[model samples]
Target: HHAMEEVTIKANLIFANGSTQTAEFKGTFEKATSEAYAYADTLKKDNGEWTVDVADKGYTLNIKFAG
Candidate 1:
């Protein structure tokens, strides 16, 4: 059923310098990837733009989305 259609996402960010952070997002996005990206906007650091992993072209961030 579509009732209460939503998702719970937990974000974990691990950098190479041994710095780490964790957060959670729960909203009405249908796909988990969308939800992950939504949380990515908030995952930004002071001088960085926290986005998704990209292969075959550029860098890749090992982001794990949990519940």
Candidate 2:
């Protein structure tokens, strides 16, 4: 029998303007979490400070910001 393993993470980013964004990326779940985090880093910009959250176990990611 042949088997295969795969992993992916859904990232949610909240901007300083009260807007939110989300995306998905390829990653490795067998060894480390760096691959996922690396992808998240690419999405960051110098526009402003943002909150980032990532996970693969859920269908959607939710982040709450308090003003």
Candidate 3:
């Protein structure tokens, strides 16, 4: 039997334009990473290029726009 559960995580997006966006998701822990990348990709594709700093031990991700 497979045990499945919903995991909720908070994500924040800070853009080059001095704007911010926040989102929440309910899924597996792995989904959090996917969500983070998906969001960063969107920002890079639409707004500007960016670089990511990830802290796995802390379950943290920081994405910043590059000049």
Candidate 4:
């Protein structure tokens, strides 16, 4: 067996599709609670093409996206 651990990521910017964007890969997650948020880095496929919604009961990539 192994000990528990955590993960994170960071991305750079790039211009494309008439806009700039970046992406930081995120993997399997636990959940986002009231006190404990889903610790993840920002991944912008396109600057104006990203969104956030923690209203859902559990945490999951918006539309099967990565963390």
Candidate 5:
């Protein structure tokens, strides 16, 4: 049977100085016909703060550090 579940995603970024920073997050998915996939995103550092942006949220990614 289809059921809703929670998911955790961790993103790690390695710097040129051999240092790695990881961000852990959690999200939930519904068990329905919402297969249209409303798009996905992650947290980012913009001017030194965490920011979230979706595809339709109007945030453009020119160069991807890690995707």
Candidate 6:
């Protein structure tokens, strides 16, 4: 396995109303994604645990890793 020296995080959220939110992070592959997912909680989206909350609200979640 090739460990990444630098990792890039790209997190996206799309709304049914034609709006989008884009977030990013840069650091260790292990922690960057975790930091990227630090998106929401009052709405329950972090770590995508029970993330369907967004879907129910007409929002779409997308996460990506690029290094």
TM-score of 6: 0.52
Best by TM-score: 3
- How well is each residue in 1-67 modelled by candidate 5, as lDDT tens digits? 6434664443343433445554534554332112112221222332122223333221221212332
Better of 1 and 6 by lDDT: 1
**Whole-model Cα lDDT per candidate?**
0.50, 0.48, 0.65, 0.31, 0.32, 0.49
Residues 1-67 of candidate 2: C-alpha lDDT, one tens digit per residue: 3223555555565555667776655544532345444544554554333344434454234333333
lDDT of 3 at 1: 50
Residue 58 accuracy (lDDT) in model 3: 25
lDDT of 3 by residue, 1-67 (tens): 5335566555656678777776655676677668767867876767688766665552556666754
RMSD of each: 8.3, 5.2, 3.5, 9.6, 10.3, 9.9
lDDT of predicted model 3: 0.65
The TM-score measured for candidate 2 stands at 0.46
Candidate 4, lDDT over the whole model: 0.31
Candidate rank order under TM-score:
3, 6, 2, 1, 5, 4
Clashing pairs in 3: none
- Which residue window of length 10 is worst by lDDT in model 6? 50-59
Give candidate 1 regions above 4 Å deviation: 1-4, 30-39, 42-47, 51-67
Q: Give me the overall lDDT of model 1.
A: 0.50
10-40, model 6: which lDDT tens digit per residue? 6565444445567666887657766755653
Structural similarity to truth (TM-score) of each candidate: 0.43, 0.46, 0.60, 0.21, 0.35, 0.52
In the range 1-67, model 1's lDDT, one tens digit per residue, is: 5535565555566544547766555665346546556666554554255534533322223463222
**Model 4: per-residue Cα lDDT over 1-61, one tens digit each:** 4322342232223323433333433443332221122222233342323334443333323
Candidate 2 residue runs with Cα over 4 Å from true position: 1-4, 30-32, 43-45, 48-67
